[PDB]
UniProtKB/TrEMBL annotation, chains A, C:
Cofactor binding note of this UniProt entry: Binds 1 [8Fe-7S] cluster per heterodimer.
Annotated Nitrogenase molybdenum-iron protein beta chain N-terminal domain residues: 1-55
PROSITE patterns: NITROGENASE_1_1, NITROGENASE_1_2
Subunit structure and binding partners: Tetramer of two alpha and two beta chains. Forms complex with the iron protein (nitrogenase component 2).
Binding-site residues for Fe(3+), renumbered to this chain: E108, G352, G356
UniProt record similarity statement: Belongs to the NifD/NifK/NifE/NifN family.
InterPro entries the UniProt entry points to: ChlB/BchB/BchZ, Nase/OxRdtase_comp1, Nase_comp1_CS, Nase_Mo-Fe_CF_bsu, Nase_Mo-Fe_CF_bsu_N
Underlying gene: nifK
One GO location term (cellular component): molybdenum-iron nitrogenase complex
Classification of source organism: Bacteria, Pseudomonadati, Pseudomonadota, Gammaproteobacteria, Pseudomonadales
Protein's UniProt name: Nitrogenase molybdenum-iron protein beta chain
UniProtKB/TrEMBL annotation, chains B, D:
Molecular functions per Gene Ontology: ATP binding; iron-sulfur cluster binding; metal ion binding; nitrogenase activity
SUPFAM superfamilies, alphabetized: Helical backbone' metal receptor
Taxonomic superkingdom: Bacteria
Official protein name in the record: Nitrogenase protein alpha chain
Length: 522, 477, 522, 477
């Protein structure tokens, strides 16, 4: 039943007694459910070191991964170019998922097409799908560019993208001059960040490889910036802001910040802003190219160094104090522009915030996950704050990256208790936060289920989730925030210290039991 | 608009297309005539999508793993292939359940064989056998395993059926191989059918010779309600207040034992015709269990459905049915009294999957609203056969609508509200059009039954009449 | 005891069994404590309507006020002027408190002097303290300006500030040309916001009253901006940012954002930035003067209209959508500068966020308090979001203000359940959130004790606190935030919706009880 | 720095002052000589602050309401006057307690008469009487009221003593009038004295003719411990482990009954000499109760104090004293072993109020650190008498230091750590100097006793050796 003036949705509707009774009869009558004592017994077992050992012996089963598949990153890369339609050659189910996934993180429209290959392509190939798909897409959505990636169906069957596109142009399904860069993006290799790299290098090749003869490094006096797979709008904006602040000429290659933040003013803009084709064509004339996330831009790096002859500098992701410092010092050396007084002041304000919050941050223990560059920058900044990264998980990381993160940890006393895990998933992590409990988790929305599990053991075992990463589905507008530069370091620091103080307030809210420490001032 | 104006709208919109796509899409767009019973002469459906036109459709894996099997709560469903499908479909659908997740229930977990290239090249059957042993060790209270095939499984020639037989025999466990690879069919719909056949072949017959279940004359099963936001619970309560015993729910909050007990019921109550009519027809032929379609959206349809269901039993059930109707009468009448004045005359355009584009019309009409356009991603012509009589004359119908078409139709028709999915929502909110998610219920609901109607009405009002929609134009523009 | 590798501070040290046992013996042995049953019975009583009625019959007792005293606002005003030392004529205890209050909110140094009147000065007045005080302050801290306010002791004994300052100059304690504006700021009149108004008029008078002959309105083609009592650095910054965006010439009169955010770079800067004396002298030549918080700038308004002859526009605080729109339109009309595309786009992005979050915000009920202009702007924005302000408390509001807010409430369906309270305190509000419980409170750190009280009744009665206002002592760096303009509206919206979602996640985290609604996507 | 260099530093700093201020401030700055026994031969104290020099001192209301009376948990303390004082001092001092706030304890609440102009012109005595009635109605479990006079009360000629007598008789309730107006005295210090006299005159004697309390030879009171971060609790546990019975704590976690029971104890243990020596001397004169000073900062002083206290009783208390020392020996030795290597040799400057600037020196030395300068806001010469033998030779002493002096001293001496208050903290952090709040313990603590030494050590190390302090200079500068 419902009271018209106090309508209840599922929570708390189904706590009503009549629903509780009905669900009890359903369980007892027909579910043949395990007794609650057995359920409690098994749950307790899944929190033990014994279970953890069996868990970490898995060789074939993956549970609750912390990565996605390549074409997701190719789509996000493609969205960053002016009037470009992302186009995934293969099966349409994938595109439905790519769009929904980004829709839920950004809360924005996300355009992407498929050419809807069906079972007949398993025998005959997908050329006709490409021919008609390119003509249909161009006519209906009027992109200036179509950037092609692939689903795993197309990869297993071996569709020759170059031949299909070339025949499409030969036969007049699209004009010969219409830009159709492409990349093979197999979901059974790497992860979504690999697909970003593959799509970017494919676009860069399309516009420069056959026109290198007139290029001269440095002749346009700009620096190219390649962001990689980036799902915080503030990160595109902070890089552009700091470079403009220094008067540094730059080209951000793949820039989706406008199209993922269009105003709600009565009209839907399928396209907005983005890197221009001329910027790609002119990129070889830059002074140099800087890769903001080098650990998933290895193929782009090979092409930039090997073809454009740019001496790509060895920079970490500009996260935290030291690596933001190093980024600005390198940009200054390449551009000849001094670091202005405004950025020197912003740096000092971040240091001031670190001094202000260091007592609450000191020694705090974290479990964290994400993509390789994000994770290593987060670890580095935690160390700078005097925090202890304890469980560091990168499902899609490799042995070289692990080696590099272990070295960063070895250089600080705050890394003594840290272990780096690669190839491990959030069911592995769940075991680690039971057997070697940290104070918090730093991660994406999938961590909410680990927090639920830990609370079930008891309130003193609960590990709260701090939401930094991708995807974040259960809070609104966190995609607008920033993790790079001094600005992003201030935001992370504020989030961490106030997460600590919120939890302390919760633990000391108990009247006459724990509220002796419910201080007004912290 | 007149029939001519709508016909002209259709033809104007189609002028963007190349000839091949124009000729095809023309067959999937129609102006409604409520007298039509053979919809195939007005609109074509369940055909392949035209390449590159931005269909909203998903794949057969979504219809099998996402829709039919995923909800079964005490089984472990393996997404078998590379890592994407299982991750994008992890906990996106609000098929609600009661259980202890990770211990005895597993719905919101993503179990996957995470194919790498070595698995494509040498095949995944050895990895699958090992994965099954690891599942059995780390999740000992699971009551069964399903294997949901992603695109590469059939393309590389793996034999998951033999693994399931050998491992199921070895471990005395139900292991269901499902060939729902996303290149099969043309949409989610074939996955429903593939999923139904796997239930039939590997699960449903297991108690055929077991006569220890104590039957009653009033045993029914809810077939095709996936308990979105609790929808099936707010349906089940009314059936049991009517005096019936709901032995099983397929598959919202559903257990594998419930499924195995379904062949013992007296009547199957089919809500989602599209996704479950296959198994319902099988159960009549094999077990002699009749089935009927019903509709629990809004009070008019819920009352009619309760009365139609009760009519299949004896007078005692029909008496309790009129007692249920009397009990809830003041409740839905209060909802109508409050919200209909706020919504009367408002026009709605719907676009959803295979049932709701016609099933929710009565609920909107119970609030004085008018559905001026509707369509399906993946319905068949027997779905459209059931939709024409429910829609007004000269309303717009669209099958597997394209992104371009849907936007152009909305710009011309100017509905007060649109109800569709997550890939549509944020487009129309930029345009300043109120929008309600009619798959996920916008994280609200239930909408089924009397208790759901109150929430439905509240939700349509909160969004349609929200202050935010009056502010999109800057006052200096 | 302590484990050296797991040292425990007060919480949870005193939960050790030996400390629990000792504290039980202290209570039983010597505290003659009321029985726990009686304590429980009286607590329950304080949550009832019967207790509320007695509570609201108070005429002499105030409990837990939501306001401070005038000289606090005078100091904040004075800090916003270049190389200016705030100086409070009167007793030194007041200054130790003013500084500490701001230290804890801003986590920054706060400089301010007293002339330390003692009981001698109570009998004979404080002229000698003023003479030596001005001389000592100028020589020691080398300010270019000393801005003088008063403590209640000096007001009660009736010190003549004008004469004392004139005599300090006549007798040579400070140069006659040295600027020493002043204001009487009695703590038994109004509140801290009155002190700001009084101090600002005094500074404005000092620099313009006797020099109006050569002034022509509009001759400098700028707009004066008077911010009022403002403790979010973001609010100073967003106003300057938007006006520079439109290319409007402006003069922010009282600007402490530089001095309250100096970098931690190795040197302490007593003074930084601020409104210059030249800017004050020239202010009458502006086109007009805009008051960001008119409800505590009445005395400044009279002077600006009466002496400068500025047609001060009738504008509300620029909070929320409508009132930021009206602010920008009025600035456009006065300056002749059009609203640029960038601010139109920012406006549309706010509206987009409002459409994105409206379902979770609809109908949510709030209790809130603060200063008059802040409170009414928060009430206005909540109405624009479809939320229900229920309990609106302004301890230092007046009847004219209450009438204006009741009119805002009456013009919106979402205001039907709201009541505006003036002269009531947070012990009054505590009763209201028990008897007519809202979903959240919006207020300053003192609200944490109301949340504690509500939780003690039971989890279902708990009213969580959302921290927006002044002072905020128990979280770090929130003083950096913004509440004005579209930027401030976006930040408030995000804070409100994610507080709602955080609490829903807490209520649905219980396994097999409420986690059926523990959705990944919201 | 040598004796002569510290003297030159003093003289150079004093050059900025006008002659009158220079002459006075010279008398409040000294180079320490541990040989001297009469400190008034080297330094003057407890004098009026020079106007306009930014003293760090508070007022007498702070010393009385904020310090002595406010911690008493089961009484209600009225900040009598306008709204500022009670608001700025609401819950700023971490004088911890166990109670149900708003019901049977009131420490962190702000009760005020919120004077308006009418109350100034016509007087507040009628308001106070009505306020007392309202307190009794709305907080019936309060066990007494104090009236903490703010500046205007004495200036307008109010008679809070008559109100308290009349209302106290009428309601059979202890109502304590305190004339702690902030214009009285020169600092917090006179507030202490006024507060002590109020306790003496209105509370302490209520059980003088009641013989029902059964004393024992081991009954003590902790006098002058305000339980900052739990300090008194980690002090009380040691004393009772030694076999003593702590009958009262003044006034951290204190109750009015235990104050009234204090004349029945056998020994008054005084931690804060400055604030509570007055009532200690009174109880010696009136009840014959001895008092002794002790120090529970760090293991060396804590052991010295336990042994000095136990020697006043008998062999059994002394045997229990050595068992306490033996129990905690491995605990504090582990603290030293971990943290002294991290802190050995580091130099610290202190500036606090009236006790800790000398009382914490031994704890720093137990970690190998050296206090190179110290001083007090409001100490008297008997405090400096006790400080010079605790400080090294040729160190720097400053009484009522100005903001300018302290910054200039710090710039020259270059300490590794500074320990002072909230109005100093953020100045020195900007300069890149590690800073620890030595009033509030930076929201940490306790620091008293063996359990507090662990926290003290952890806290000094975390701040002094924090990574943040190595980053203040931009690498490009
Ligand atoms: S057709 Fe229906 S909303 Fe029965 S319109 Fe919708 S692919 Fe849902 S709960 Mo999306 S009645 Fe199918 C459905 Fe269920 S699109 Fe799919 S998941 S089983
Ligand atoms: S110990 Fe006490 S609050 Fe007696 S807790 Fe406090 S360094 Fe004060 S008035 Mo800060 S009883 Fe000492 C004190 Fe006085 S910290 Fe200092 S100044 S003379
Ligand atoms: Cl889960
Ligand atoms: Cl409180
Ligand atoms: Na493998």
């Amino acid at each position: 039943s419902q009271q018209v003036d106090k309508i209840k949705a599922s929570y708390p509707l189904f706590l009503d007694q009549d629903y509780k009774d009905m669900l009890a009869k359903k369980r007892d009558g027909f579910e043949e459910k395990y007794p609650q004592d057995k359920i409690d017994e098994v749950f307790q077992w899944t929190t033990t070191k014994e279970y953890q050992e069996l868990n970490f012996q898995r060789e074939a089963l993956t549970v609750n991964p912390a990565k996605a598949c390549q074409p997701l990153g190719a789509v996000l890369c493609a969205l960053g170019f002016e009037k470009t339609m992302p186009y995934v050659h293969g099966s349409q189910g994938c595109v439905a998922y790519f769009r929904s996934y980004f829709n839920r993180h950004f809360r924005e429209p996300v355009s992407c097409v498929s050419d809807s290959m069906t079972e007949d392509a398993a025998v005959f190939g997908g050329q006709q799908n490409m021919k008609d798909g390119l003509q249909n897409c161009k006519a209906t959505y009027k992109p200036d560019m179509i950037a092609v990636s692939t689903t795993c169906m197309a990869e297993v069957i071996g569709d020759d993208l170059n031949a299909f596109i070339n025949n499409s142009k030969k036969e007049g399904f699209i004009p010969d001059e219409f830009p159709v860069p492409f990349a093979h993006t197999p979901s059974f290799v790497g992860s979504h960040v690999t697909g970003w790299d593959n799509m970017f290098e494919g676009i860069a090749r399309y516009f420069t490889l056959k026109s290198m003869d007139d290029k001269v490094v440095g002749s346009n006096k700009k620096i190219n910036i390649v962001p990689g797979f980036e799902t915080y709008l503030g990160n595109f904006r902070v890089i552009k802001r700091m470079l403009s602040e220094m008067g540094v000429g730059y080209s951000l290659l793949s820039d989706p910040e406008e199209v993922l933040d269009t105003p709600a003013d009565g009209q839907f803009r399928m396209y907005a802003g983005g890197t221009t084709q001329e910027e790609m064509k002119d990129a070889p004339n830059a002074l140099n190219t800087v890769l903001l996330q080098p650990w998933h831009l290895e193929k782009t790096k090979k092409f930039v160094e090997g073809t454009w002859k740019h001496e790509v500098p060895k920079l970490n992701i500009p996260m935290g104090l030291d690596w933001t410092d190093e980024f600005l010092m390198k940009v200054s050396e390449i551009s000849g522009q001094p670091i202005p007084a405004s950025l020197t002041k912003e740096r000092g304000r971040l240091v001031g915030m670190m001094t202000g919050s260091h007592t609450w941050l000191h020694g705090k223990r974290f479990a964290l996950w994400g993509d390789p560059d994000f994770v290593m920058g987060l670890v580095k900044f935690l160390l700078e704050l005097g925090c202890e990264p304890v469980h560091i998980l990168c499902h899609n990381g490799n042995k070289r990256w692990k080696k590099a993160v272990d070295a960063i940890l070895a250089a600080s006393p705050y890394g003594k208790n840290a272990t780096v895990y690669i190839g491990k998933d959030l069911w592995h992590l769940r075991s680690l936060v039971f057997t070697d409990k940290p104070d918090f988790m730093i991660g994406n929305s999938y961590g909410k289920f680990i927090q639920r599990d830990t609370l079930h053991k008891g309130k003193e075992f609960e590990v709260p989730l701090i939401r930094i990463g991708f995807p974040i589905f259960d809070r609104h507008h966190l995609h607008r925030s920033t993790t790079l530069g001094y600005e992003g370091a201030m935001q992370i620091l504020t989030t961490l210290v106030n997460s600590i103080l919120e939890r302390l307030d919760e633990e000391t809210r108990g009247m006459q039991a724990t509220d002796y420490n419910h201080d007004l001032v912290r | 608009m007149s029939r001519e104006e709508v016909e002209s709208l259709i033809q104007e919109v189609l002028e963007v297309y190349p000839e091949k796509a124009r000729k095809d899409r023309n067959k999937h767009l129609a102006v409604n005539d409520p007298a039509v019973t053979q919809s195939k002469k007005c609109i074509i459906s369940n055909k392949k999508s035209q390449p590159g036109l931005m269909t909203i459709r998903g794949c057969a894996y979504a219809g099998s793993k996402g829709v039919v099997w995923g909800p079964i709560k005490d089984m472990i469903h393996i997404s078998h292939g590379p890592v994407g499908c299982g991750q994008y479909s992890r906990a996106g659908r609000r098929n609600y359940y009661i259980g202890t997740t990770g211990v005895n229930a597993f719905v919101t977990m993503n179990f996957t064989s995470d194919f790498q290239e070595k698995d494509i090249v040498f095949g995944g059957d050895k990895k699958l056998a090992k994965l099954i042993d690891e599942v059995e060790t780390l999740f000992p209270l699971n009551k069964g395993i399903s294997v949901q095939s992603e695109c590469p499984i059939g393309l590389i020639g793996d034999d998951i059926e033999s693994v399931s037989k050998v491992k199921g025999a070895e471990l005395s466990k139900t292991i269901v191989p499902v060939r729902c690879e996303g290149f099969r069919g043309v949409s989610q719909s074939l996955g429903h059918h593939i999923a139904n056949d796997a239930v039939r072949d590997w699960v449903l017959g297991k108690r055929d010779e077991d006569t220890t279940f104590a039957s009653t004359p009033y045993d029914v099963a809810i077939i095709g309600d996936y308990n979105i936001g609790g929808d099936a619970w707010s349906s089940r309560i009314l059936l049991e207040e009517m005096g019936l015993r709901c032995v099983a729910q397929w598959s919202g909050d559903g257990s594998i034992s419930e499924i195995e007990l379904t062949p013992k019921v007296k009547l199957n109550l089919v809500h989602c015709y599209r996704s479950m009519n296959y198994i319902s027809r099988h159960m009549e032929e094999k077990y002699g269990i009749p089935w009927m379609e019903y509709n629990f959206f809004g009070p008019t349809k819920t009352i009619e459905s309760l009365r139609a269901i009760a009519a299949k039993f004896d007078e005692s059930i029909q008496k309790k049915c009129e007692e249920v109707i009397a009990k809830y009468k003041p409740e839905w009448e209060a909802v109508v009294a409050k919200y209909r004045p706020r919504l009367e005359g408002k026009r709605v355009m719907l676009y959803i999957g295979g049932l709701r584009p016609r099933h929710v019309i009565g609920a909107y009409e119970d609030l004085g609203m008018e559905v001026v356009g509707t369509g399906y991603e993946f319905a068949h012509n027997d779905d459209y056969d059931r939709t024409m009589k429910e829609m007004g004359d000269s309303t717009l119908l669209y099958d597997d609508v394209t992104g371009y078409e849907f936007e152009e139709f909305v710009k011309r028709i100017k509905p007060d509200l649109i109800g569709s999915g997550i890939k549509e929502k944020f487009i129309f909110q930029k345009m300043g059009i109120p929008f309600r998610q009619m798959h996920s219920w916008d994280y609200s609901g239930p909408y089924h039954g009397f208790d759901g109607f109150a929430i439905f009405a509240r939700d349509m009002d909160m969004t349609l009449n929200n202050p935010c929609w009056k502010k999109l134009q800057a006052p200096w523009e």
